[PDB]
């Protein structure tokens, strides 16, 4: 428990049956402005979409928005694997709600999810 770190969990998605769902488990170091964690994308479709990536990035606060930029792959930033994930979270100033877009790589192609709600915990 260093002073500048706290965790946060984000629920990203419309929440509609069959819509894509992203859960981000992030650790936030408020010193370096850095973010690290895991992204899990699922979808209750046939067949099922079960995308996962180790993610890292940073955040920027703009007056009140908190913008979180993420990219991800299999293994983290020290892995030399290709990035299979991009995400951008625009939280409202309270840091509990906002909008997000992301891209993940699956079946030899990229898939983009744009402007979906975000919730904390």
Numbering used by the authors: 5 to 67, 78 to 135
Could you pull the original sentences from the published paper?
Finally, we continued to optimize the crystallization conditions and identified another condition that grew well diffracting needle-shaped crystals that were suitable for data collection on the synchrotron microfocus beamline. We were able to collect a complete data set from a single crystal, which could be processed in space group P212121. We refer to this crystal as form 3, since its unit-cell dimensions were distinct from those of forms 1 and 2. Form 1 crystals gave a combined LLG value of 719, form 2 crystals gave an LLG value of 394 and form 3 crystals gave an LLG value of 305. Importantly, the Phaser statistics for molecular-replacement solutions using the refined form 1 crystal structure were much improved over those from AlphaFold-predicted models; the form 2 data set gave a Phaser LLG value of 624, while the form 3 data set gave a Phaser LLG value of 662 (compared with LLGs of 394 and 305 for the AlphaFold models). The form 3 model had an R factor of 27.3% and an R free of 33.3%. The backbone r.m.s.d. values between the experimental structures and the AlphaFold model were 0.35 Å for form 1, 0.49 Å for form 2 and 0.46 Å for form 3. As a result, no biologically relevant interfaces could be inferred with confidence. One potentially relevant exception is that the form 2 noncrystallographic interface is present as a crystallographic interface in the form 3 crystals.
